[PDB]
Design a protein around this ligand. Sequence first.
Ligand SMILES: OC[C@H]1O[C@H](O[C@H]2[C@H](O)[C@@H](O)[C@@H](O[C@H]3[C@H](O)[C@@H](O)[C@@H](O[C@H]4[C@H](O)[C@@H](O)[C@@H](O)O[C@@H]4CO)O[C@@H]3CO)O[C@@H]2CO)[C@H](O)[C@@H](O)[C@@H]1O
Lengths: 368, 104
Amino acid sequence: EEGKLVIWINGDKGYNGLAEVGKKFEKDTGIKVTVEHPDKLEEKFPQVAATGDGPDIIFWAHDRFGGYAQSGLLAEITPDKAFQDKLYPFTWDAVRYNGKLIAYPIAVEALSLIYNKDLLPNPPKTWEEIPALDKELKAKGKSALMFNLQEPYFTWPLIAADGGYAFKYENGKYDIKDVGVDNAGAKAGLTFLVDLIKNKHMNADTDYSIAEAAFNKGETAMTINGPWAWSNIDTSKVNYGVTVLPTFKGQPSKPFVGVLSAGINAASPNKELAKEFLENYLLTDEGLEAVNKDKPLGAVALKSYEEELAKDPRIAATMENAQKGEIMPNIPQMSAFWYAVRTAVINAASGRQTVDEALKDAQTNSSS
Amino acid sequence: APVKSQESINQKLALVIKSGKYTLGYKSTVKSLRQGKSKLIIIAANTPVLRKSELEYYAMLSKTKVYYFQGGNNELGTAVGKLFRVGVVSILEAGDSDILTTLA
Ligand SMILES: OC[C@H]1O[C@H](O[C@H]2[C@H](O)[C@@H](O)[C@@H](O[C@H]3[C@H](O)[C@@H](O)[C@@H](O[C@H]4[C@H](O)[C@@H](O)[C@@H](O)O[C@@H]4CO)O[C@@H]3CO)O[C@@H]2CO)[C@H](O)[C@@H](O)[C@@H]1O
């Protein structure tokens, strides 16, 4: 309907904060803004947008937009140079597809190691020392590590550490034929993960909820998560620290860097109102603060505000891990990649398959 | 996939109007659907008052493909302008147009 903006953003982000920015927008223009956080919104958007339905604005990490752009579901955005200059060129490149800007960049995200300082005055610098650390903590009724094992996003950093990668980036272009989830590096990483579970250091059923509850309750000494999680830890009054992910085989864990982006529905009858909202309301120091105060965005795309927050050691750790990882590709095949890697990790973790077998199939399924 | 230019849709539509068979609007379209004569229906998602759900319901029961045009009334060609104006266009015969093999 014309005269109102409907926004879709993931449930782990600051949707209440975004609703604040929308409430302001409404007062100033009289246009009602509604924020929703449906589940699997990134799978639903392509389905409902393709039929003239769906939100006016969709929020998600940049990796999903190439797919949307290719299916002509996104309205091309065209900020004038004055606005483009307000944001970092790295974030704009993330939302550029086929040489066309397809969404607005918001913030840069990367996973970090989060630890309980009272339980671990000194967190491990390597993955290898985690088993011994766990045996010690189990002796006290605690566990060393717990993080979401259901989403490949979280395990990928370890898998990429010694060699894994999605698509070979050959001089400005990705080769959808050269996939690196099958190489020896990736196998080492995943094997190390499987063994942790085999040796009872971790449980294959652990999801985002299980892990977040255990950490925030001081049951486990460490977790792995993004900026959005800091907010709940703060309320839990757990004395935590945010730092570099532990190495593996003397090499840095390589998390996939994501840029939270906002795309405008091509079928939206409010493209102008949407751009007005994103450019002059959300991507301002006041807009981002509203959202950030709810759930941290990480390293925002707006130069002015990222500078105001750059001193936060948690952001520093975020950018440090981000600098060590790779920015996710945004091409259509990424979905296939993620789906493929998800199955591989879940199968190897539960034993349904062997590391080799699992990665062998993901390798095939990715480039499929 | 709605991966086509408004300029392209308008050109394909103009060709059907020029050399094929088609209906315009709710009434003639569901009739073409109920009769199983429609080969495709195109819906201008953003047309003012549109019985979108009902049209989609009829396309489903008649097993007829539907293509959605996403543009607004602004900057429209002749054919697409009619489309946007009547909300729905049902293609009964493509004629010299390739609309059926490129949109359905
Ligand atoms: O996992 C939470 C964090 O996820 C983010 O990293 C994301 C990528 O940006 C995604 O594009 C993505 O790939 C996903 C894909 O997008 C989607 O189809 C998804 O489908 C799941 C669904 O999430 C869930 O409901 C479940 O039931 O299963 C579906 C199919 O298995 O899954 C792909 C891979 O699982 O995923 C990664 C994470 O793997 C993001 O950037 C972070 O900010 C976010 O916190």
